[PDB]
Amino acid sequence: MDKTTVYLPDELKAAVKRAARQRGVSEAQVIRESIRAAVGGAKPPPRGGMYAGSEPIARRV
Amino acid sequence: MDKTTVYLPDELKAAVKRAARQRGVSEAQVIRESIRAAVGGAKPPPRGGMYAGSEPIARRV
Amino acid sequence: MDKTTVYLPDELKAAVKRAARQRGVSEAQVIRESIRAAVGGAKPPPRGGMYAGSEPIARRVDELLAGFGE
Amino acid sequence: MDKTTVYLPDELKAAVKRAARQRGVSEAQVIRESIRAAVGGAKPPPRGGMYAGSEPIARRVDELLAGFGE
Amino acid sequence: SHMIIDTSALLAYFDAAEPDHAAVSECIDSSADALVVSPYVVAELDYLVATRVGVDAELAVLRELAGGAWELANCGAAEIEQAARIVTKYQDQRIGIADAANVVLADRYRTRTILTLDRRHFSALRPIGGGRFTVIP
Amino acid sequence: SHMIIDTSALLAYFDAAEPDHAAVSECIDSSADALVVSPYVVAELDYLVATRVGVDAELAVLRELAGGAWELANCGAAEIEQAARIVTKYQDQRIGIADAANVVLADRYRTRTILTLDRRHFSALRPIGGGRFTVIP
Amino acid sequence: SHMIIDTSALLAYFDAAEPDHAAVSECIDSSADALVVSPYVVAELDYLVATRVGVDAELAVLRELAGGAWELANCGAAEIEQAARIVTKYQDQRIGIADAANVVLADRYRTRTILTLDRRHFSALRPIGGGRFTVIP
Amino acid sequence: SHMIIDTSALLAYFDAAEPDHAAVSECIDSSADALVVSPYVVAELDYLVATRVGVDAELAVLRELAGGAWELANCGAAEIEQAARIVTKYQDQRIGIADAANVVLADRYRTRTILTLDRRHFSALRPIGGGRFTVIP
Ligand SMILES: [Mg+2]
C-alpha cells in the first residue's frame, strides 16, 4: 500500500503542528524529515562479489 | 484519538523497519521517537530573567 | 499552516490516485508537481537600481546601523 | 465531488496567484487545469492491433528471449 | 478486477496477426479496471518486439504503453524482496523476476486474475494469500 | 488566545533588572498559547542586547528563543508585501517592517492581543480585521 | 550526487571473478553518489545472471539490490514516452529501452555520470541537457 | 546554484548612486543561482534604507523583495540554535545574528558563495562543512 497510519499521542501531533506552522511546511514533511534525521546514517553500503561466475559475460567491448 | 495517516515514501520505511529490527521494537515506535527527537513533546515553558542589565532600555522616551 | 482546499471531479480524483499509485509517490505530491509544471519556471527577474540615494552607506553598514530599532 | 486538502508551499501558491491574475480567472481553475494537464481525465481505453507481424511469437516467449540483455 | 498482464498477452494484443489476438483483445478491452504491466514485462516486450518485428512496432508499443491506458506498476525494494522470496519458493523451476514480480503485483493489486498465454507456467504458481490464480483467456 | 510579541517586551522579559520585568513576566509565564515572535523582532532584539548589554546576554537570548517555547513565525513574500501595504497605510507613523509584520501576524494568528511597552505608538494603528488591539501589559 | 548504472557494470560488480570487478568496485564502494538503477537494467541483469550462472546467484543479486544500498528508479508513462523519443533520435545506433531510459534517468536525477562497460556504444549518446556523458569504467 | 546575500550588497544593488552598484548588479543579474536573503537582513535593510533614504525607497525595496524573485529564507529554532553556536565560536568578534545566520544558511543551501562588501569580516568566518567561503564581488 501507499499511505501510513501510526499512533501519535495528542501532545506529539500538537508539536508537529507547531513545527510545521513555524517553519512553513506540511506536517507530513515535518514528520518525514524527522524520520530521515533519526535514521539518516544507517543506509547499508553496497556489496559486490557475491559469487564467482563460471563465465566472462560482462563485456561486449 | 489517532487517525494520523501520513505518506512515507518507499525508501524510508525501508529505513524504519531496518531500524526497528536493529533496535528490537515497534516501528510505529521508531517513528514516534524520531518525531519527538525533532519537534517533540509538550511545549517547553519560556524562561526569562536570564541576566540583569546595568541600565533600562526596553522602554522609550 | 492553512492547507489549500481543492475540489476534484471524480474523473480527476481517480486520475490523481492512479498517477500516485503508479509513481510510488503521494497524491499531494502528484498535485504539487502538476501545479509546478504548469505555473513554475516563470519567476520574475530581480530589479536593481531602484532609487537615487545621495549619501553612500553600503560600505558603512556597521557604522550606520547604530540606532537599529529604535 | 471529493474534497481534497493539499499543502502548497508559499512559492507555488504565489506562482498560482500570479498565473491567475495574468489569465483573469480563479486560482481554483488554474489548479484544476494544471492537474488535468498532468494526470489527464477519465482513463483512456487501451488500443491493440497496431501492426501485423510476420510470424506468431506470442507462445514462444521463453525461446525468443534468448539474447536478452545482449 | 485488476488484472496482471504478461509479456505473451501483450504480444498477442498489440499484433493483429497473432492467433490469440482476438481472445486477448476480448479480455483487455471490456476490463474497466487497472491493466497492470510490470517494468520487467516492459523490458522483455521491448526486446522481443524490436528484435522479432521491427523498431517501428517497438516504438508503437512503447508510445501506447505511455498513452495513459496502462497501470505501470511501481517496483521498488520491497517488491524485489518479496519477488526474491517467490523465486526461492519456486527455485527448481527457474521462473525469473518477471514472473515472481507478477505474483507480488497480483498481491499488491488484490487480484488473482492473470492475463497470459503461458498458462501452464503460472498455473503452477500460487497466490501469496492463498487460493488459486485465474489465468485468462 | 495568542499574542504577538514586540522587542521591548522581550527586552523586559529576559532582563530581570528592567523595571517592567515583573509585569511582562506575568503576562508571558501565564499564557497557555502561542508566543509569537517575528524574525524581524529577533533581529532588533539581537542587536540591542548585543550592543547594550554584552555578547553573553545576546547568546542567552538566542539560546532561549531556540529553546522550543517560542513561536517563531514564518514571514515570507506574502507577509512582506502585506507589511508594505500596512506601512503605506501608515507613514503618518514611521512604523517599519517590525511593527507592520506584527500587525500581519496578529491576523495570521487571528488575535488582537499585542505584548509591548510602546503603548499607543502601537495603539495608533488598527487590526486588519477591525476593532482595536489589546495592548498588554 | 547521482550515478546511473548500466547492466554490464553490475555484472562486473556482483561477480568477484569478472576481470572488471575491481574497477567497478572502486567506483561503487567509496562513492558518495546515490547509485541509480532502472528496473530495465534489473530485468536484464536478472535474466543474464539466472541463465549464465544460476538461481542462487540471481537470488544473491536480487536480495542485495533490495537491501537498501541502491536507488531503484521508477519508469512510468513520461519516462517511456521520452525514452521512445530517444530511441528515435539515435536511429544511428540501435539502442532500445534500457539504454534510452538510462539517458532519461540521467536527466531525471540531473547527473552526467554513467557507470557502464559499454563505452563506445554510450559515448555516441548525448545527455538531454547538453554536454557529454562522463563514463566511468 | 546558490548565493547568500548580505545587507551591504543589497544596499549597493538597490541604489544606483552607490559606488559598488554596477559590480553587484553584474553578480546578481546573470546569476542563475537562487538569491538567498535572510529575514534578519530584510530587517537591517528596512531600517537602513528607511532612515538614510526615506520611506518611498523603503516601500520600493520591500515590494521588490516580496515580488517573487528572491528566496526569502526561514530562520526557525534549529537555525537560531546553530546560529548561536556560530556566534559563540566567534564571540570576540561580536559578529551578530545576521552574519551568523548567513553562515547557517550557507550550509542549509549547500553553498559556500557569499555576496557581501564586508569581505574581510566574513573571510574570518569558516563554512560549517569546512573549506573557505567564496566572497563576491
Ligand atoms: Mg543495456
Cross-chain Cβ contact B58/F69 below 8 Å? no
Nearest-angstrom CA–CA distance, C36 and C34: 6
| Residues listed for chain D | 70
Phi first, then psi, for residue D2 (nearest 5°) are: -90, 135
Whole-number Å distance, alpha carbon G95 to ligand 1 midpoint, is 8
- Beta strand extents in chain G (DSSP E only): 2-5, 34-37, 71-72, 113-115, 134-136
Nearest-angstrom CA–CA distance, G39 and E75: 8
Nearest-angstrom CA–CA distance, D42 and E100: 31
> How close does chain H come to D22, measured CA to CA in Å?
15
How many domains, chain A?
1
Indicate left, alpha or beta for G15 from its phi (over 0: left) and psi (-120 to 50: alpha). Answer: beta
Task: List the resolution, Å.
Answer: 2.7
Instruction: Give the cell for residue E18.
Output: 497473432
Instruction: Give the cell for residue B58.
Output: 526596553
- Whether residue H29 lies within 8 A of chain C, CB to CB, comes out as yes
Q: Residue E6 annotated as binding?
A: yes
Q: Which amino acid is at F15?
A: D
Phi first, then psi, for residue H30 (nearest 5°) are: 65, 45
Instruction: Report CA C58 to chain centroid distance, whole Å.
Output: 29
**Buried/exposed E66-75: b ≥16 CB within 10 Å, e otherwise:** bbbbbbbbbb
Which chain A residues contact residue G36 at CB under 8 A?
none
Domain that holds residue H56: 1-137
> Does F137 sit behind a cis peptide bond, omega within 30 degrees of 0 on the bond before it?
yes
Which chain A residues contact residue D10 at CB under 8 A?
24
Which chain D residues contact residue C34 at CB under 8 A?
34-35, 37-39
With beta carbons less than 8 A apart as the criterion, state whether A48 and G29 touch. yes
Nearest-angstrom CA–CA distance, C39 and A48: 44
Instruction: Report CA D19 to chain centroid distance, whole Å.
Output: 22
Whole-number Å distance, alpha carbon E82 to ligand 1 midpoint, is 25
Alpha carbon of C33 to those of C38, D34, E125, F119, H33: distances in Å? 8, 9, 40, 47, 21
Task: Please name the residues in contact with D53: beta carbons below 8 A apart, sequence gap of 6 or more.
Answer: E15, E17, E18, E52, E53, E57
The three-class DSSP label of residue G52 is helix
With beta carbons less than 8 A apart as the criterion, state whether G64 and G14 touch. yes
Closest CA to F2 of F37, F43, F26: F37
CA angle, A42 as apex, A40 and A43 as ends, to 5°? 90
Q: Residue F99 annotated as binding?
A: yes
With beta carbons less than 8 A apart as the criterion, state whether E132 and E111 touch. no
Closest CA to H135 of H120, H118, H115, H121: H115
| Residues listed for chain C | 70
Which chain F residues contact residue B43 at CB under 8 A?
68-69
Q: Which amino acid is at F77?
A: A
Q: Most distant CA pair in chain F: distance in Å?
A: 42
> Partners of G113 in the beta sheet?
G134
Nearest-angstrom CA–CA distance, H112 and H106: 6
Domain that holds residue C38: 2-70
Phi first, then psi, for residue D64 (nearest 5°) are: -95, -10
> Partners of F97 in the beta sheet?
none
Task: Please name the residues in contact with D11: beta carbons below 8 A apart, sequence gap of 6 or more.
Answer: none
State in Å, rounded, how far the first CA of chain A is from the last one.
43
How many domains, chain F?
1
Nearest-angstrom CA–CA distance, A8 and A19: 15
Instruction: Report CA G62 to chain centroid distance, whole Å.
Output: 15
Rg (CA), chain C: 24
**H/E segment holding residue E52:** helix E39-52
Sign of CA dihedral C51, C52, C53, C57: positive
> How close does chain E come to C9, measured CA to CA in Å?
18
Rg (CA), chain D: 23
The three-class DSSP label of residue H22 is helix
Of D43, D51, D62, the CB nearest to E69: D43
Cross-chain Cβ contact D4/C9 below 8 Å? no
Instruction: Give the cell for residue E48.
Output: 522481443
Nearest-angstrom CA–CA distance, F19 and E92: 86
Which chain C residues contact residue B10 at CB under 8 A?
24
Of B22, B32, B40, the CB nearest to A7: B32
Q: How many CB atoms lie within 10 A of CB B22?
A: 11
Whole-number Å distance, alpha carbon G118 to ligand 1 midpoint, is 8
Q: How was this structure determined?
A: X-ray
Chain B: list its partners (3+ Cβ pairs within 8 Å).
A, C, E, F, G
> Partners of C8 in the beta sheet?
D2
With beta carbons less than 8 A apart as the criterion, state whether G125 and G91 touch. no
With beta carbons less than 8 A apart as the criterion, state whether F86 and F95 touch. yes
Closest CA to C2 of F106, D13, E60: D13
State in Å, rounded, how far the first CA of chain E is from the last one.
15
Phi first, then psi, for residue B39 (nearest 5°) are: -100, -5
Whole-number Å distance, alpha carbon G73 to ligand 1 midpoint, is 15
H and E touch with 3+ CB pairs <8 Å, answer no
Please list all protein residues whose beta carbon sits less than 5 angstroms from ligand 1, which is an ion: G 7, 98
Q: Which amino acid is at H37?
A: V
Nearest-angstrom CA–CA distance, C21 and A2: 7
What is the 8-class DSSP label of residue A42? G
Return the axis-axis angle of helices F55-65 and F39-52, rounded to nearest 10°: 160
Nearest-angstrom CA–CA distance, F74 and A20: 10
